[PDB]
Structure formats: C-alpha cells, structure tokens
Chains A and B, each alone.
Chain A
Amino acid sequence: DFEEIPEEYLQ
C-alpha cells in the first residue's frame, strides 16, 4: 500500500 515515489530516486 506504499505510494509511488519519484522515479528520479529509483534510478
């Protein structure tokens, strides 16, 4: 149930 975090960090 976690909210989508910015892809800028996923990279």
Chain B
Amino acid sequence: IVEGSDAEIGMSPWQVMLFRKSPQELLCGASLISDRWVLTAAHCLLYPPWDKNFTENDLLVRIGKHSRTRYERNIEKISMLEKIYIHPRYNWRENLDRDIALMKLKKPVAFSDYIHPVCLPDRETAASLLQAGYKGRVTGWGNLKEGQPSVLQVVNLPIVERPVCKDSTRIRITDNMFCAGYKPDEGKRGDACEGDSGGPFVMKSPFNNRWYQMGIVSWGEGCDRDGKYGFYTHVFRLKKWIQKVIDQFG
C-alpha cells in the first residue's frame, strides 16, 4: 500500500496472507469469507506470462496477522489448502477479466478477536454502495512505493466513474471491474502496489453496520501514479460463480 497508514489491531480480521513455503515469501493478500473459504485474485495463483502456476501444496494461508514477517505465536493461524478453484473464464491473456479464485482450507479455522469473516454483497447492497465518489478501504502488506511495511497497511479510496477509468488506460475494461483512487487534482493520494494483489476492497454498510467486500485488488499500471487508478475485480458480478462453487464443493 502506498500512502496508507498502519492498521489498528483487529481492524481487518478477514485479511489473509498467501504465503509461499519455499522460498518462504509473501505472495498476495486474500480474504476470509467463512471458516473454510478464502477469496483471492486468480493471477496470484496462475499467470503463464511469468510462468506462475501454483498448486495447493505450494502454499500456506496465514490468518489473523498484523506484522508482515513475524510468526505471531498464539495469534495467527496457518492453514493448508485442500483445493484451489479458478474462474473458468479468467482472462490472463488479455486484461485479467474475471480475476478471481476460491481456496478451500483443509479444516475450518476457529474465529477469534483477530480472525472473522467479511460479508459478500447482495444485489441491493451492491446497488446502493458501489457509486462513484463513495470510498472503500484496501489493506495489505505490499510495497510502500512503486521497502515493505512492518505491519498491515490500510488506505481509504474513492470509487471512480467508469468513463474516467476507461480513459486512463489502453487496457480494455469490462463490466467485471471497477477502478478506485484519487484524481490528480484531488490532493489526497494512495493506491495498492506489488504484494497487495488478491486483497479485499471493503465498504461499511450504513444500513446494517457490517463490512462487505466489494472488490479484489486486481491490477494497475505502477503504484499511486497520477492519472492512473487501481482496478478491482467486481465481486458482486461474479457472486453466482462463487455461490456455485461453494454449494457444489462445500
């Protein structure tokens, strides 16, 4: 995260760290949506252009963390994966369209003060909250500039008008994406960066006071560049796929 600040303890209890066993390294962010399921960006697992193609046994899921590098004994929980599910129509060849994947853990995680799932949006919540100008929150242990942070970083960003998103890049944008960030004249700044991918873009409903994950950190051109914006996977647009996978595979 660029231009963000340290998260408070227990601020994002659904934040998950995708950790590579060997070498031991942070791969991406992710989110806990139930005691057995984790949501992340498909490019974190499969991206042929960089010969990236991880399988269940190559990774570890670390939940309940705050510090990036320390093994938070008695606080975090490390889980193994049972099965990875990548959207059948994930478009890695062109624009990362449908950049989403689900990961089923071997055994349920027990919730605690630091581990708790985020809600997935219903059509109504998505309708009322996903509006240009409304701010969401992004979290992660990724780069601070285009040094990695000591602890989880957080930044609040405004959703941007589709036209503006379209006009800032050469990449073909689809209905399965939305972009966020401050305009160059807006003064404030901030953005996700390397290491943040797969993480959650969440919003707090003013109706029932719950946090909902509206997006997944997907891609950008640089980090916190003026005139550029971060792009996120539109979670609601892909909810039927999510429902399908979960009720079909447990």
Contact = CB atoms under 8 A, between A and B. Distances in A.
Contacts of B25: 2
Nearest to B24: A2
B71 A6 contact: yes
Interface string B13-28: 0000001010011100
Interface residues of B, number: 12
Interface of chain B, helix or strand or loop or mixed?
Answer: loop
Nearest to B80: A9
Contact of A5 (B26, B68, B78, B80): B78
Interface string A1-11: 11111100110
B60 interface: yes
A4 B176 CA distance: 39
Interface of B: 19, 21, 24-26, 60, 68-71, 78, 80
A2 B78 contact: no
Question: Sorted from nearest, which 3 A-B pairs have the closest CB atoms?
Answer: A9-B78, A2-B69, A3-B71
Contacts of A6: 71, 78
Interface of chain A, helix or strand or loop or mixed?
Answer: loop
Given A9-B78, A9-B80, A10-B21, A1 B71 contact: no
A6 B69 CA distance: 14
Nearest to B72: A3
Contact of A4 (B19, B71, B80): B71
Nearest to A11: B80
B232 to A, nearest CB: 27
A9 B73 CA distance: 13
A6 B73 CA distance: 10
A9 B60 contact: yes
